[PDB]
Ligand binder design. Sequence first.
Ligand code: 54K
Length: 231
Amino acid sequence: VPMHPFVKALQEHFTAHQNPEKAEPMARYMKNHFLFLGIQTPERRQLLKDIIQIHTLPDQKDFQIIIRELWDLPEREFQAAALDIMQKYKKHINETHIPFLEELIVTKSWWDSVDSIVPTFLGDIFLKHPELISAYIPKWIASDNIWLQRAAILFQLKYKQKMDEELLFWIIGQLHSSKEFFIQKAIGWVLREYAKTNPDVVWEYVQNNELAPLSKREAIKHIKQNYGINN
DNA sequence: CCCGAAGTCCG
DNA sequence: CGGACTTTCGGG
Ligand SMILES: Cc1cnc(N)c2[nH]cnc12
């Protein structure tokens, strides 16, 4: 069974505009975990738009198939394009897609893909179906996979006043001893971001609970101005 | 335009 | 460690 014609077309069109000179520093930026064609986002989005204009967006029955096929291609631009395409099918994504999204998180994993899946797609799903959080978050925290652990931390990133504070701090407490940069930094990020909504609670949390130095520093990057730095 | 959100380099 | 500074992306 051949690849979907939409994916074959995208592959051909992206490859025709590859830039090996840019691809080298792009690959180094991602610590050489991926091959790159060398196409940056504004052009990549236009090339995708070209293929949609010519071929039309594939029927929804093929949505997951298209995403997986792009996920399996070597160059990182194809996963970036897959995420652009998933945004176009956004109105069709629901709680039944959580395992599909899990699998994307733990394949071809790095911060660029995981941070584009978690606070947006998963965040939206768990906002609508909070009763399902406990069907996934404990497993993710207990996982060997740091990207699932990061997912547990960041799915609430954009919740603002809908933040479940008790949940947030419980998750952070479970992971606060991790020596993994991407976990320490995610804790810092979600605290920094939530501090834009409720700075008092974040300040109290970081002053009174154990965190990695990186996590605490990133959490209070802005709000330390509001409280001051004691002698 | 602006600002806020990985990377290298250097005490 | 944490500050100084980098490019790229998203959004106001
Ligand atoms: C994630 C992130 C944070 N700060 C910056 N200055 C960045 N530049 C590119 N990505 C960045």
